[PDB]
Amino acid sequence: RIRALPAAPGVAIAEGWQDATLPLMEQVYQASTLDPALERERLTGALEEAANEFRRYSKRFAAGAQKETAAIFDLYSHLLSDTRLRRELFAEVDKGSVAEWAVKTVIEKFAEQFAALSDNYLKERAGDLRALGQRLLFHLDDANQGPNAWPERFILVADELSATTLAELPQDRLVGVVVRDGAANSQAAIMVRALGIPTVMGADIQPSVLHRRTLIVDGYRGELLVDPEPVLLQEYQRLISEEIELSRLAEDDVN
């Protein structure tokens, strides 16, 4: 019974699940380690696993999703692979820095550089960068990876629609998603809309009470119901079957 701004028309029903994407900056530690080469090589080896993973990821989207997605990632794919980023990370190690932290620091330092830009048309790229680092952090350890969670059916629930986030989970199992912000024509908001996947924003609810609860998203009416009286839902099906299953069907609201 929550009124949310419909970013992409359409209706879908499924449980609410949040991406395993969680802040990893709080894991920043300071120390000295002796692994100039071991670390340097470790980064390169990680890139091949991350770079190739990113290139293959977009490749799949382009085969389906949209062309914009590939354009976005493809651009980033070359970034991380750019001997510029790699050299930068190795530079920190040349002093005695650890990739784990070095990679995080390098990405953090760039975050400020990306923001410095005024043109939001690209400046926003910063947000994408942060996501890139998260992928490298996990790839930096062959002990952590996997699809992260490939369910049968559900919707993504994030405060802001992040293209990078979606590029992590399979669309096949992902139908729609409700965000609490990601408003405007965000790269992820413009790509999802063009994709034709139901999306809503303005949700002032926390995912804590969503875990796997039932959430019905209605892009058409940009409404969010919560395990509502099964009786009401029953009439809904009959309401659309009525005839005018287009407009908004004769309902309440401003009579």
Partner: protein, 85 residues
């Protein structure tokens, strides 16, 4: 020698950002180094993502694209053609 050309940015360096991204592919397909520079004197090295971001702010400003090599002309011409739409 090197070959450059002044191009006025009419609030659009070309098509969204493809031009900048394609440049990276052209540099590999064409022998020659391409470098961008804003009227402010800011060298927006086409081989730097940070530079590309700075160019975005060049909406309505003049820049000086420079290309060196045997195909420098192609690289420069390709960039100019993309910037001109």
């Amino acid at each position: 020698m090197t070959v450059k050309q002044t191009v006025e940015i009419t609030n659009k360096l070309g098509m969204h950002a493809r031009p900048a991204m394609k440049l990276f592919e052209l540099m590999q397909g064409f022998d020659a180094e391409v470098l961008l520079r804003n009227d402010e004197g800011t060298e927006a090295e086409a081989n730097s993502v940070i530079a590309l971001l700075m160019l975005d702010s060049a909406k309505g400003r003049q820049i000086e694209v420079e290309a060196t090599g045997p195909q420098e002309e192609e690289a420069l011409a390709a960039v100019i053609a993309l910037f001109n739409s």
